[PDB]
Symmetry: T
Amino acid sequence: NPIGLEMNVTTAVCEGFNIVLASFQALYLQYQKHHFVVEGSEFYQLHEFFSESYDEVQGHVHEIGERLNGLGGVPVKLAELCCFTPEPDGVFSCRAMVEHDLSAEQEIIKVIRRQAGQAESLGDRATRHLYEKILLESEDRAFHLSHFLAHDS
Amino acid sequence: SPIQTFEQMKDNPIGLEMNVTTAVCEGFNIVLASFQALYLQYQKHHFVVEGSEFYQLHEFFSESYDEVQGHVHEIGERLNGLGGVPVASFSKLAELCCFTPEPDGVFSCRAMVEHDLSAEQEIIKVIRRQAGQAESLGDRATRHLYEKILLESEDRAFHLSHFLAHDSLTPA
Amino acid sequence: PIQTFEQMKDNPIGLEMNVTTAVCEGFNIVLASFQALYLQYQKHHFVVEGSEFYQLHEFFSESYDEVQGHVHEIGERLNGLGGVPVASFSKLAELCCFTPEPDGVFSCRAMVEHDLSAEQEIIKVIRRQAGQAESLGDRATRHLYEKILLESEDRAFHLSHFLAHDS
Amino acid sequence: IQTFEQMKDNPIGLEMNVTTAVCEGFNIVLASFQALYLQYQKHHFVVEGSEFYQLHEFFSESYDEVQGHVHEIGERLNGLGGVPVASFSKLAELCCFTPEPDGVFSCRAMVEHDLSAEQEIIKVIRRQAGQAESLGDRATRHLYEKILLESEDRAFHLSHFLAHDSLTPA
Amino acid sequence: TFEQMKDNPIGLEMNVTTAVCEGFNIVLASFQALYLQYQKHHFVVEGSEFYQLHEFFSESYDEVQGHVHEIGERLNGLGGVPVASFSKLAELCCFTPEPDGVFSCRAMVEHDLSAEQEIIKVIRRQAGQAESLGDRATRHLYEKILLESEDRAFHLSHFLAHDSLTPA
Amino acid sequence: PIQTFEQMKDNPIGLEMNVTTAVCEGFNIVLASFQALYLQYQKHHFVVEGSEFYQLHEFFSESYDEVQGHVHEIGERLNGLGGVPVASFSKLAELCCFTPEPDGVFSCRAMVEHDLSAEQEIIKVIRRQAGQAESLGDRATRHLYEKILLESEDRAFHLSHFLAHDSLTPA
Amino acid sequence: NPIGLEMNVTTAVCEGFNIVLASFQALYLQYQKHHFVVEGSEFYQLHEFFSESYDEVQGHVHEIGERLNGLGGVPVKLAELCCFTPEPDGVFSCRAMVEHDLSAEQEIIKVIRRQAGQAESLGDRATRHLYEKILLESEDRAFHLSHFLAHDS
Amino acid sequence: TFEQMKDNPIGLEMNVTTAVCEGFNIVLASFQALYLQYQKHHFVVEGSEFYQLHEFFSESYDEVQGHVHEIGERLNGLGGVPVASFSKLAELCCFTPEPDGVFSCRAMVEHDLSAEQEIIKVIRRQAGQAESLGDRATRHLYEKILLESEDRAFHLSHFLAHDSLTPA
Amino acid sequence: PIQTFEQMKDNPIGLEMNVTTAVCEGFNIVLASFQALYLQYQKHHFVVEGSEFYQLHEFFSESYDEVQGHVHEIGERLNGLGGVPVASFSKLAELCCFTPEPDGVFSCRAMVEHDLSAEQEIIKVIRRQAGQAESLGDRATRHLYEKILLESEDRAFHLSHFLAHDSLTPA
Amino acid sequence: PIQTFEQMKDNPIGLEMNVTTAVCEGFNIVLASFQALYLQYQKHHFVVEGSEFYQLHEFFSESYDEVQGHVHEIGERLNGLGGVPVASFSKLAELCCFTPEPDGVFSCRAMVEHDLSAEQEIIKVIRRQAGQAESLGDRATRHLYEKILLESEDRAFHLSHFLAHDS
Amino acid sequence: SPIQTFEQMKDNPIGLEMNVTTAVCEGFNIVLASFQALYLQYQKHHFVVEGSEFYQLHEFFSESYDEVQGHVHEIGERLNGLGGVPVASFSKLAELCCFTPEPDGVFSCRAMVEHDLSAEQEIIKVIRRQAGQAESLGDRATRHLYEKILLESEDRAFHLSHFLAHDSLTPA
Amino acid sequence: IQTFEQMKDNPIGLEMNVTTAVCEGFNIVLASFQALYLQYQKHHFVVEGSEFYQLHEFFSESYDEVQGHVHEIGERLNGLGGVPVASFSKLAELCCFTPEPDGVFSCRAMVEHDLSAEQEIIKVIRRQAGQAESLGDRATRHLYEKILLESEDRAFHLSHFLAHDSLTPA
Ligand SMILES: [Fe+3]
Ligand SMILES: [Fe+3]
Ligand SMILES: [Fe+3]
Ligand SMILES: [Fe+3]
Ligand SMILES: [Fe+3]
Ligand SMILES: [Fe+3]
Ligand SMILES: [Fe+3]
Ligand SMILES: [Fe+3]
Ligand SMILES: [Fe+3]
Ligand SMILES: [Fe+3]
Ligand SMILES: [Fe+3]
Ligand SMILES: [Fe+3]
Ligand SMILES: [Fe+3]
Ligand SMILES: [Fe+3]
Ligand SMILES: [Fe+3]
Ligand SMILES: [Fe+3]
Ligand SMILES: [Fe+3]
Ligand SMILES: [Fe+3]
Ligand SMILES: [Fe+3]
Ligand SMILES: [Fe+3]
Ligand SMILES: [Fe+3]
Ligand SMILES: [Fe+3]
Ligand SMILES: [Fe+3]
Ligand SMILES: [Fe+3]
Ligand SMILES: [Zn+2]
Ligand SMILES: [Zn+2]
Ligand SMILES: [Zn+2]
Ligand SMILES: [Zn+2]
Ligand SMILES: [Zn+2]
Ligand SMILES: [Zn+2]
Ligand SMILES: [Zn+2]
Ligand SMILES: [Zn+2]
Ligand SMILES: [Zn+2]
Ligand SMILES: [Zn+2]
Ligand SMILES: [Zn+2]
Ligand SMILES: [Zn+2]
Ligand SMILES: [Zn+2]
Ligand SMILES: [Zn+2]
Ligand SMILES: [Zn+2]
Ligand SMILES: [Zn+2]
Ligand SMILES: [Zn+2]
Ligand SMILES: [Zn+2]
Ligand SMILES: [Zn+2]
Ligand SMILES: [Zn+2]
Ligand SMILES: [Zn+2]
Ligand SMILES: [Zn+2]
């Protein structure tokens, strides 16, 4: 390790980095599928939102991956280590599309929080910090999805 | 310690006289107050709208509060230029408001579109009367600025009325 | 009147006059169709309203800009080949591929369907004229036709999504 | 729903007494500007000769300017509650000037034709802007004066295109 | 309505969302007052150095509006309601806004500095609260706003320093 | 000279020379005033110094290019309306509405005051010419005149703001 | 189908669209992993190249996907329908990284060519055309990889 | 070396790569000659309409250089060697370049038009060849270059038309 | 006037007033010539018309803003070197190196030729002042003078190119 | 000399003078270190050559620009808190975290290793000063420290890849 | 039909005389020819380089052929301005070339870097002698343009020499 | 490999007779400009007062200008085959002027200090540019004249910053 962190903590943080990376990759490809297949009266809204969300989540991926390899691990079984349940096959309701996306982001929020706690416990600040950086934007995306799901028109 | 208290103006560096800069200045203050209230309302709507069309309303409300903030900015800069004092207190900003601001709380998307629409209309009438005043009194620049603010705020009210039409790709 | 809308003139790229005449009256057919579709999209941008009025406002406007691009392409290529593009209202109306929507405000539903029908009737002539231009050996024209066709098909796709029964 | 004769209410506080007049003036102006847009586009397409590049680019820039004019006037027109003209029947009926017949004409000829169209659209615009002022609608009078400014500029540039001067000696 | 909270899509309990959303509302109200004041100062500033203060006040009220918008979006997302009317924005504002009327540029800079200081205190404390209840993203947003607010205070103090090219 | 100065020719937009003569005379005098104002603002961008040297450096530059943009608008429209714009040194000298600053460097305050006075008398000339153009039915001239008026009134605002007896220093 | 193509050909082209989409997705994620994990003396070169290549290949993906859903199918088993062999786990030689990438792009080139032939046979031009559009750039990427693999310095 | 071919990373046989790479070399040589000529014309053009031809010649030689670079990169990728020296670039060029010296603008436009026409013929034919041997990407690149070359010829012919604002 | 024209003051870069006086005189005359050239190019952007109206429209505009950029460089450097730049109408009139075009619209060819002659005599003045600045050891003045020379020589090239007896028409 | 490099002055944000003094001499330590590292990266950009000389030319240059950003941040924050930043060569040299590379051209290998060692010695002080500033309640300073630290760690990562044994 | 044959000039619209514009013009033609050859060589190198560092050489060669093309452009525009005729034939472009162009074929990366380097050097000496000539004869602008072309081409040769140094992170 | 005394060969065709001299002049100029960059940066950091914003932004823009100067001169210096100065020992030894001592000084004082530094760096630049001309190296003489132009401009602007004039009356 080339930053002075003990092996102890680098393994433990790369562990969670691969969990969140697999989950974020699943989220990215599912948002991509949604961007592809949405139709209906509000489709355009969703058409853009999904495209703005996957372009967002992959960002997460890359820097996790870039810093994951940085700490001495190997970035990602993408099916094994993913924290949430991926979308089944076929095109669903647009409403269930955003419901699935909602819950996926919620569970990745949770594991990101736990990993930030672990990184803080053992004295590696930057990882905790970056987890917080992603956490704010993913919470924001959850806000916007639930706004999509509100019973109003 | 104030050097130019609210209801006390001075001179203007343009060559106008105070038979009409005073009139145009407190005609400006009304529109400034109501436009500030409308900007705050559009910002709250940007914040809290939800539902089927919520993305459309989100972005439209941000666009519109930026437009009205630009109106506020130029009205205030010109008002200070001609010798007036702009309103800033919540007290007077609530007093001089030409329309009734929306009460606090989340409304249905339709309800806030209606509130916004008639707020716009009631500011449009103030603006037209003040443009007529500025024309009668020989102040060209104020009437002309009023007229272009008028044009694009009428455009804003057009788009607002368009969101309220009873039509859609849905069966409703 | 130096040249009129039936006299065909030579081309500076080395094509024979038969393929010139054929490809160019096809050009003018689908250009008149594209201009009619452009103006339909434009006034639809003007008159659309309702719950989803922002989405369609944007979509209509982008569509009439892209069809304007198509029209400039076909017109420049058409004169370059030695023809003369259509511009009169009467001729334009006549050679339009589809029946334009009658003036007056229609429902947003009906407007979307009018646009999608106009685009499919234009896609028909584009496919056909592409087959033609390929048979006559006009490769650059065929290539142009293919581009215009693909993005017209994509517009048909986004119309198809606008009219789906969901939410 | 609404056809090209019946009018809808306006959400701005203007009376249909004024709306009807300003929107029919608007429709005349829109038909005129659409005819000029098509003419300038054809001119960009078919122009050729020694000064071909100048006229190519000038024709294209002015057709996009008049295009902008039609979007502006059309969106305002709909705002008042009227219905804009679109099909070729009523665009030919309601057009201010006589459009150029089909076929590629001389450089001189179609520059002059554009001057003709611009001049008489200017006539309509100015006097119906006076009308708009009389009706108490300031916003459309202002919009009219901006459009009149830009079209008078276009007429100036065409006017200079057809001046009797050149670097080619007399 | 006001004085009410709905649910949450990120998994925080209402014990934490109510408490942090009240502080968002307070900070948003004071930031809106500071935005209006910075705008008034950009309008009415004049004198020897008036262009400096012109540009600084404009920059500052746009930064403050950015803070306001981020806090408002996050506040509604957390299930609260942002304040918008003048009555509660005057009530809940942590500092006393400048009374109406034109003040001299120096007094304007002093008012802005002390307003920034009080809002900094409120921000620090609500950030501490947010940290104790386990809301880390709120905490992070508060700290970003706090850093840039502290720099705004730095620049105001620099404007207030007793030094010049003039022998004053 | 194929078209002599004071010889106005036909316009291609349908105005009559009774209005074009007057509005081109007005255009030429405000053009001369603005061409002198451009050079004075530019001279101030050159020679200004002092404790507030930076602010007025950039203010004078921005004002001189605003004034010279006014110049292009007025000149292009004027020649569009048959007339000929002023370009001769003596001509502008003649037709300057204000007195240009005498030569040499002055105190920055005196320079701001000179610029303000030049602005203000151009204000008066512009308003009188706008009234003229309105009465004679030339709407576009009056409209351009109006936004020239708006931005130059803003410039005069900023100048007098420079002139206020206030500062972070004692005064 | 909303463009006038018979069901006959739409099914047949969506078939190959999912093959090439799964292959391109595997290629994209593998180029991403390479962008993550490359080290050595020339790493920077590869560091950027991989990032410029995956951003490229995903482009392919999206428009395939956007037009796939367009023809009436459902876009993507990503492991099942992929035409080439994905990378095994761990960080390999940088040379074998680009060798694996080389062969992956070669085989997707081949199936793209066959799908273009099929689309041409049955009269749908735009698909054949788009396959050609992607084919040129993927051939170019193969050129650049083999250039990376040349025995010279 | 010249007159040699190596392997291929995209799976075409040398029966097709040799044959299409020879035509790439021919088209690249003629395009380099046309680029040099358009540049010389941009340099030496003068007269009544000289600014039009100035800008057109510059635009045209940059378009032709784009064609040259795309063909060269694809040619090396296919396993061939691009031509670069003056001897073989003068040999393999399909048209006769303009002799040295300044010509009148009209003769320059005529030379450029006929050069574009001959290169169009060569391009069409090598595109047909490429199609028959199953090289589709080469075919597509050739057709793009052909479309924009045909438009260059269109604009040259427009410059050569007998019409003007002058009564000439 | 706190600093009178023809009264040069101390420079903060270490030159002696023997060289600054001469180079500021030269700067002022080339500044006056370029300030007249800017106005003449601008007048040509205004009043030009004909069959080649478009080309010279944009050429005259680009040339006048190039010339006025020369003006800013020269003026800022001049006041940096103690002197004061010319701004008075009569002053520029005096110190114009060429004869400005008489008033009224001329044929476009005559206007191009007037601009070319103005350019050429500014060429001569610039070269003489560059030799002066070099002999007296002022390298930066001479260097700026040299690129002014380069771009104005390019402008003269383009003007004479306009003047060639050649076209797609018969001549 | 109004204020000198030991007199500390009040802060306008409401912090107590103890945390001011502590956080600000930490600021000056790591700012002097950052400036030394910046100049080392700059002359390495100057003097690097070899087979991979383009990669390193670019990397060195981007690194000395990013460290310049760090230095501006720390200096502005440091004066704002009430301290005075270091600028003299003697003081800068003394308070530099690491031993700067001695003048003269070194191998690209050795230069990369010198830079990576300087960055690790600076990361040490950044981590430590972040812990400090957090203990004293200076939250904005701690946040700044965290940003600077993370991207310094990323630079250490790209150095680590430059020195790997591959190809 | 040529109106100004290669070795036949005319007048220059600047006020120079033909004792030195002729000299500077065919001094310009040499550098134009060699710079055109170098641009073609750099383009071929952009095309055909491969190997360990091939990305670096790829982009560097494109950068450098753009730089030398800019040199060619300004030399040619100024040459036509002062009354000369620019070289364009392959015949004369090969004749007047100051250095020997690389023979056709793919070389090792090192070999083409060496060819490029010494081509640059041999053009640098031509450029310096021509700058001295232009200075002696009183043509300032040509010498100054020569000097800035000189500066950035010396920079190009610096970077070239840097690629050739016997150093690297590899054990070689 | 190469230390700060021995010189390497240049690939441009200049002789070490010239290279040694121009590179030691270069190193003097580089040390001077690095000292001025650090000074301008400190000035941007610690400036305050009534005109604080002016000097803030001016100091920062000029420190980036002198920064550009050091990149330019350093890359050319290495090009000749010399070795650039970097550590604080030789930057303090070889610097043209006396750097400002530590601590925040008056506005007047450090504007004047910057004027001092600029003036004497101008001295060095001009006479050693004359030297560069005598040696037959035209490119570095040209580069020197551009840097001299920009630094004389900076000296002008500082000079005007300290003029005895203000809108605050006397
Ligand atoms: Fe690693
Ligand atoms: Fe799992
Ligand atoms: Fe005021
Ligand atoms: Fe009220
Ligand atoms: Fe034709
Ligand atoms: Fe029909
Ligand atoms: Fe309507
Ligand atoms: Fe009619
Ligand atoms: Fe909510
Ligand atoms: Fe309160
Ligand atoms: Fe005229
Ligand atoms: Fe007078
Ligand atoms: Fe579908
Ligand atoms: Fe498989
Ligand atoms: Fe190869
Ligand atoms: Fe041949
Ligand atoms: Fe001075
Ligand atoms: Fe004279
Ligand atoms: Fe301080
Ligand atoms: Fe130390
Ligand atoms: Fe010539
Ligand atoms: Fe030779
Ligand atoms: Fe070296
Ligand atoms: Fe020393
Ligand atoms: Zn990366
Ligand atoms: Zn949002
Ligand atoms: Zn403002
Ligand atoms: Zn709209
Ligand atoms: Zn076109
Ligand atoms: Zn889409
Ligand atoms: Zn064209
Ligand atoms: Zn619109
Ligand atoms: Zn938002
Ligand atoms: Zn103009
Ligand atoms: Zn014009
Ligand atoms: Zn998409
Ligand atoms: Zn490449
Ligand atoms: Zn390339
Ligand atoms: Zn300046
Ligand atoms: Zn300046
Ligand atoms: Zn470099
Ligand atoms: Zn700063
Ligand atoms: Zn990286
Ligand atoms: Zn050129
Ligand atoms: Zn700052
Ligand atoms: Zn560099």
